[PDB]
Design a protein around this ligand. Sequence first.
Ligand SMILES: O=C(c1ccc(-c2cnc(-c3cccc(OC(F)(F)F)c3)o2)cc1)N1CC[C@@H](O)C1
Length: 278
Amino acid sequence: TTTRTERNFAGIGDVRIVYDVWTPDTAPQAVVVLAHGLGEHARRYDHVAQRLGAAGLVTYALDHRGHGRSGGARVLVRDISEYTADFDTLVGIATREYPGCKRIVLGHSMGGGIVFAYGVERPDNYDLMVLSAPAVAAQDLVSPVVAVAAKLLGVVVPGLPVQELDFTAISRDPEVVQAYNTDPLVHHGRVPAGIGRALLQVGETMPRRAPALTAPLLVLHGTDDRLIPIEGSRRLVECVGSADVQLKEYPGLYHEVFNEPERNQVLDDVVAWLTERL
Ligand SMILES: O=C(c1ccc(-c2cnc(-c3cccc(OC(F)(F)F)c3)o2)cc1)N1CC[C@@H](O)C1
């Protein structure tokens, strides 16, 4: 059994950042610090934390600013460093509470871009990285017109909507799509300029900064992901400095591999990989 404790801290700008700590009833083997993606929140990761907890891992998971239970204007950000700074605070909380534990940083989609950006800035502050469909090549997905709009408007009017996404592509399971669309904590609007700018900041610098990532790296990606094409993860694993880097491709899976019907197999793979490398 893994128990959830809800806490908060003051993020950049004195925003209230809510986070969960999931603690198993066994001696802790390592600590996972988890970053969710755009428009969602950490309580879409209960089952992930519970599965990791069965492996003896403690999971810290925040709601990013403008998401879920945390404060701030919804999906408002001006710079990727807002997200990575708050992520860094959570890593520091985990480090102080479990100083004898290795640290795993885990991110999905936009959260994978956040974790990647954190990981190249602080490569000695964690031991292992796991990324689910990381949004690290957004420049391939944003048209030239809204790339200009996002880069010129993203700090002046970060809340300005510039594009809509097909949430029905998050999963092959209609129950997952339905639960997403009815979740009051999920953002159901358009993607705003500030998010676009932050996504472009990660993607434009990924090839030049990826060599600084030398920790063991596991990337998970569904081959039928229509939100973040798998080619971006294939490029990522070619650019990182890590010698111990793997991309596990899941044939037929959609974007949210941790929520797909095969999620217990995906999570078995993650736990097996972590077990070998801790
Ligand atoms: O984090 C993510 C996420 C997934 C996918 C994209 C994505 C793909 N293509 C664009 C995109 C493309 C053009 C303009 C644009 O607008 C912007 F220029 F950015 F303003 C954005 O965004 C972004 C975030 N998710 C999905 C739900 C949950 O699984 C967590």
